[PDB]
Swiss-Prot record, chain A:
Changing R105K: Severely impaired growth. Reduced growth at 30 degrees Celsius. Strongly reduced growth at 16 degrees Celsius. This is Pre-mRNA-splicing factor 8. Component of the U4/U6-U5 tri-snRNP complex composed of the U4, U6 and U5 snRNAs and at least PRP3, PRP4, PRP6, PRP8, PRP18, PRP31, PRP38, SNU13, SNU23, SNU66, SNU114, SPP381, SMB1, SMD1, SMD2, SMD3, SMX2, SMX3, LSM2, LSM3, LSM4, LSM5, LSM6, LSM7, LSM8, BRR2 and DIB1. The MPN (JAB/Mov34) domain has structural similarity with deubiquitinating enzymes, but lacks the residues that would bind the catalytic metal ion. It is found in: Nucleus. Present with 468 molecules/cell in log phase SD medium. Changing D21N: Reduced growth at 30 degrees Celsius. Strongly reduced growth at 16 degrees Celsius. Residues 7-237 are annotated as: RNase H homology domain. Functions as a scaffold that mediates the ordered assembly of spliceosomal proteins and snRNAs. Required for association of BRR2 with the spliceosomal U5 snRNP, and the subsequent assembly of the U4/U6-U5 tri-snRNP complex. Functions as a scaffold that positions spliceosomal U2, U5 and U6 snRNAs at splice sites on pre-mRNA substrates, so that splicing can occur. Interacts with both the 5' and the 3' splice site, as well as the branch region. Has a role in branch site-3' splice site selection. Associates with the branch site-3' splice 3'-exon region. Also has a role in cell cycle.
From Swiss-Prot, chain B:
GO terms for biological process: spliceosomal snRNP assembly; spliceosomal tri-snRNP complex assembly. Residues 244-265 are annotated as: Leucine-zipper. This is A1 cistron-splicing factor AAR2. Heterodimer. Interacts with PRP8 (via RNase H homology domain and MPN domain), competing with BRR2 for the same binding site. Component of a U5 snRNP complex that contains at least the U5 snRNA, PRP8, SNU114, AAR2, SMB1, SMD1, SMD2, SMD3, SME1, SMX2 and SMX3, but is not a component of the U4/U6-U5 tri-snRNP complex. Keywords: Cytoplasm, mRNA processing, mRNA splicing, Nucleus, Phosphoprotein. Pfam families: AAR2, AAR2_1st. It comes from Saccharomyces cerevisiae (strain ATCC 204508 / S288c). Signal peptide: none annotated. The modification Phosphothreonine is found at T257. The keyword Cell cycle does not apply.
Length: 237, 300
């Protein structure tokens, strides 16, 4: 059934699974027309498909050309997501196919179930968790590859960089969700915290700075402070 | 007009014949039902006074043989049987009629309700859904499960309704996932109508039989089948105009006949709200929408 706080450790067991977030698939700027009407302009999007055990992020770039001459784009976006996830599973050898796909939004269940009819043994699950994967486009290198794409593309990232050499996948997932929760709540403040010390750089193939263990502890503390601060402001408590 | 004699009524029982019902007292001198209209299927059904659990009954067509009811004190139910001896049967019925120990099928002359509920229902199709080929009549009861329910457990005692599953390879063509899921015309017209049922009459026949098993026996699997066959039409953008017009008449009579106090358990809120207000056919069921809005506006 549904993934929650109670069955959380399951994400880090040896059954291959993927999270699928479709939030950033269909993206628009809203603007005024010459006649003073409103119109949308689609910009490039992405599917965020993450193995929470290994950090492998299958970033399918959704080029604006996929929306050309289509209607009901917020509905089509869910089905295009399910089509690309299905294609990704079919592309993998049997021993690498997931046993479960967890969708971050319930509206993805039927589109993905229908696209995955050929895989009756893959469980399609919702989650009770409010995961901050929508903030993926606040990670500078992911945003850069999506906006530069001139055609459909899939780019494989490791969203945990080399963290798994030093920490478990439970801890790496916790660090990733804290970073993304921070970026989602206050992107400017979050990015200021991460990039404040210019001595600490981002490796060419990494997404995040090369913090020492002790620097991660300080970074992680600063991210928690940011989230509580913004919370007291949101709710005046 | 045809007759279904009873040997006797040894146990107190509510007896239904189609949409009519009569109470019979333990050992009341009751010897059956006369003046049954030729040309339709019929159902004769039972609910024991002492165990209102297990409604059960028999689908039959008097054109196919001479049928009678006799209580079996071993199996504890009223059983339909065929009398092969034409003259023994004529002789039994004539006696019981002369002694006026039979109730009359109490059809109002103006009243086409039973025809309207059974228009496309055929005994030959009933006998494929309810498999017991040694008898010309078909036993159904409250607890009998459908082949579809058995998948998700005695196959001899199952309702073999046509399996309909919106999230099945049968319903979804590879490469038309979103198209076939959101507009079920392919599934209705090519798979079901052309492929399995052959024509809309057989489809309506099964729909009508499912409803009547739901209504007369509170058969849950039959109710799921009736709703699934409605929803498949209502979710199809492309349906022949004759089928929509006939569906509106079929559903009108089914809603009209349903006991006012059973709408809570026999009508699926989601299916009806979807069919009448969201679906492709939301404007195609004028008679059904009007009777539903006036009779069950709570459900909607």
């Amino acid at each position: 059934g549904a993934m929650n706080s109670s069955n959380y450790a399951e994400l880090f067991n040896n059954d291959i699974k993927l999270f699928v977030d479709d939030t950033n698939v269909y993206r628009v700027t809203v603007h005024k027309t010459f006649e003073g009407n409103v119109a949308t302009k689609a910009i490039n999007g992405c599917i965020f498909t993450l193995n929470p055990k290994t950090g492998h992020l299958f970033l399918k770039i959704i080029h604006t050309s996929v929306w050309a001459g289509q209607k009901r784009l917020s509905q089509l976006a869910k089905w295009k997501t399910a089509e690309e996830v299905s294609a990704l599973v079919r592309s993998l050898p049997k021993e690498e196919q997931p046993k479960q796909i967890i969708v971050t939004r319930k509206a993805m269940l039927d589109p993905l179930e229908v696209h995955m009819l050929d895989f009756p043994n893959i469980a399609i699950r919702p989650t009770e968790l409010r995961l901050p994967f929508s903030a993926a486009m606040s990670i500078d290198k992911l945003s850069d590859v999506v906006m530069k794409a001139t055609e459909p593309q899939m780019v494989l990232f490791n969203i945990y960089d080399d963290w798994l050499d030093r920490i478990s996948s439970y801890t790496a997932f916790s660090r990733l969700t804290l970073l993304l929760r921070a970026l989602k709540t206050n992107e400017e403040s979050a990015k200021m915290i991460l990039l404040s010390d210019p001595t600490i750089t981002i490796k060419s193939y990494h997404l995040w700075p090369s913090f020492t263990d002790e620097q991660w502890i300080t970074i992680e503390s600063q991210m928690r402070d940011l989230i509580l601060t913004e919370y007291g402001r949101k709710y005046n408590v | 007009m045809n007759t279904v004699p009873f040997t006797s009524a040894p146990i107190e029982v509510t007896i239904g014949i189609d949409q009519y019902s009569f109470n019979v007292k333990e050992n009341q001198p009751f010897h059956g039902i006369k003046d049954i209209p030729i040309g339709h299927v019929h159902v004769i059904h039972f609910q024991h006074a002492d165990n209102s659990s297990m409604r059960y009954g028999y689908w039959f067509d008097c054109r196919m043989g001479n049928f009678y009811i006799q209580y079996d004190p071993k199996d504890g139910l009223y059983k339909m049987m065929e009398e092969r001896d034409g003259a023994k049967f004529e002789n039994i019925v004539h006696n019981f009629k002369e002694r006026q120990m039979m109730v009359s099928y109490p059809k109002i002359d103006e009243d086409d309700t039973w025809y309207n509920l059974t228009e496309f229902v055929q005994m030959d199709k009933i006998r494929k859904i309810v498999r017991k080929d040694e008898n010309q009549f078909s036993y159904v009861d409250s607890s009998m499960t459908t082949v579809q329910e058995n998948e998700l457990s005695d196959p001899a005692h199952s309702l073999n309704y046509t399996v309909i599953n919106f999230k099945s390879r049968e319903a979804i063509r590879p490469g038309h996932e979103m198209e076939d899921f959101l507009d079920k015309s392919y599934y209705l017209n090519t798979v079901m109508l052309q492929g399995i049922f052959k024509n809309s009459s057989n489809y309506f026949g099964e729909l009508q039989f499912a409803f009547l098993n739901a209504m007369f026996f509170g058969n849950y699997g039959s109710s799921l089948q009736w709703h699934a066959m409605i929803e498949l039409i209502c979710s199809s953008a492309t349906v022949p105009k004759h089928m929509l017009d006939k569906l509106d008449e079929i559903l009108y009579y089914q809603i009209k006949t349903l006991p006012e106090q059973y709408s809570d358990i026999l009508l699926n809120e989601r299916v009806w709200n979807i069919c009448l207000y969201s679906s492709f056919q939301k404007n195609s069921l004028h008679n059904t929408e009007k009777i539903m809005e006036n009779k069950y506006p709570e459900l909607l």
